[PDB]
Design an enzyme around this catalytic site. Structure first.
Site, short mmCIF file in Angstrom:
data_model
loop_
_atom_site.label_atom_id
_atom_site.label_comp_id
_atom_site.label_asym_id
_atom_site.label_seq_id
_atom_site.Cartn_x
_atom_site.Cartn_y
_atom_site.Cartn_z
N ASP A 130 -12.68 8.85 -7.59
CA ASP A 130 -13.87 9.49 -7.02
C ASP A 130 -13.56 10.79 -6.26
OD1 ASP A 130 -12.78 8.71 -4.53
OD2 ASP A 130 -14.37 7.33 -4.02
N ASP A 136 -6.20 8.37 -0.36
CA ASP A 136 -5.73 7.36 0.57
C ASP A 136 -4.53 7.89 1.34
OD1 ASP A 136 -7.67 5.65 -0.42
OD2 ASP A 136 -6.23 4.54 -1.64
N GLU A 195 0.82 -1.20 0.00
CA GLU A 195 0.00 0.00 0.00
C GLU A 195 0.86 1.26 0.00
OE1 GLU A 195 -3.08 0.40 -0.39
OE2 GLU A 195 -3.99 -1.57 -0.08
N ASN A 214 -8.75 5.36 3.33
CA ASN A 214 -9.50 6.17 2.36
C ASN A 214 -10.31 7.28 3.04
OD1 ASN A 214 -10.83 7.01 0.03
ND2 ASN A 214 -11.32 4.94 -0.64
N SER A 244 -11.73 11.04 -3.56
CA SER A 244 -11.18 10.76 -2.24
C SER A 244 -9.67 10.57 -2.32
CB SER A 244 -11.86 9.53 -1.64
OG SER A 244 -11.62 8.38 -2.43
N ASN A 258 -7.76 9.17 -5.41
CA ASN A 258 -8.58 8.21 -6.14
C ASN A 258 -9.48 8.92 -7.14
OD1 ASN A 258 -7.64 6.12 -4.34
ND2 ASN A 258 -9.10 6.90 -2.85
N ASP A 276 -15.11 -4.27 9.56
CA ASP A 276 -16.27 -3.73 8.86
C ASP A 276 -17.07 -4.79 8.11
OD1 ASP A 276 -17.05 -1.42 6.29
OD2 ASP A 276 -17.48 -1.09 8.41
#
Ligand SMILES: [Cl-]
Ligand code: NA
Ligand code: NA
Ligand code: NA
Ligand code: NA
Length: 129
Positions: A48, A52, A35, A59, A50, A46, A101
Site C-alpha cells: 500500500d 514498517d 519482525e 507501520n 506505507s 508495504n 488498540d
C-alpha cells in the site's frame, strides 16, 4: 544497532514491556526477532505504499509519520525515523499504543504467524532478567 537477544530482553523489560497488556516478555522478544531480526534500523516497504520501521516494524500507515504515506494517521505522534534509533524507547512506547488498540499483538503479523501459541519463554532463556 543489532541487539543481542538478552540485551533486547533487558531493555524491553526496563521500558515496561514485560506483561504489558498481558503479553509476557518472551512474546515481545519473539516478535522483534521475526519482525526485524533485532535490528533497530530495519525498514520494509508495504504494497500500500506505507513502510514498517524499526525493531518492531511499526507501520507508517497508522502510527508514525514518514512524509510519504498519503492519508496516514501518525497515532504515536513521532517521525518514523525515531523508530530506527539505537535507543528503543520510542519503539516501545509506540508498541504499547499498538498492542492497546483492540487486537493485542495480532497487530504484528509475524507474531501471529511465528510466535503466538509457541514456547515464547525460550526467547528469554538464560538472560539475567
Ligand atoms: Cl536469537
Ligand atoms: Na505466552
Ligand atoms: Na503515517
Ligand atoms: Na535501549
Ligand atoms: Na509472518
Amino acid at each position: 544497532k543489532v541487539f543481542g537477544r538478552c540485551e533486547l530482553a533487558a531493555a524491553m523489560k526496563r521500558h515496561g514491556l514485560d506483561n504489558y497488556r498481558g503479553y509476557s516478555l518472551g512474546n515481545w522478544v519473539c516478535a522483534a526477532k521475526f519482525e526485524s531480526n533485532f535490528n533497530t534500523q530495519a525498514t520494509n516497504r508495504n504494497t500500500d505504499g506505507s513502510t514498517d520501521y524499526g525493531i518492531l516494524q511499526i507501520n507508517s500507515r497508522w502510527w508514525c509519520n514518514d512524509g510519504r504515506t498519503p492519508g496516514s494517521r501518525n497515532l504515536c505522534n513521532i517521525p518514523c525515523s525515531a523508530l530506527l534509533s539505537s535507543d528503543i524507547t520510542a519503539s516501545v512506547n509506540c508498541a504499547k499504543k499498538i498492542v492497546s488498540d483492540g487486537n493485542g499483538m495480532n497487530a504484528w503479523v509475524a507474531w501471529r504467524n511465528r510466535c503466538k501459541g509457541t514456547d515464547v519463554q525460550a526467547w528469554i532463556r538464560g538472560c539475567r532478567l
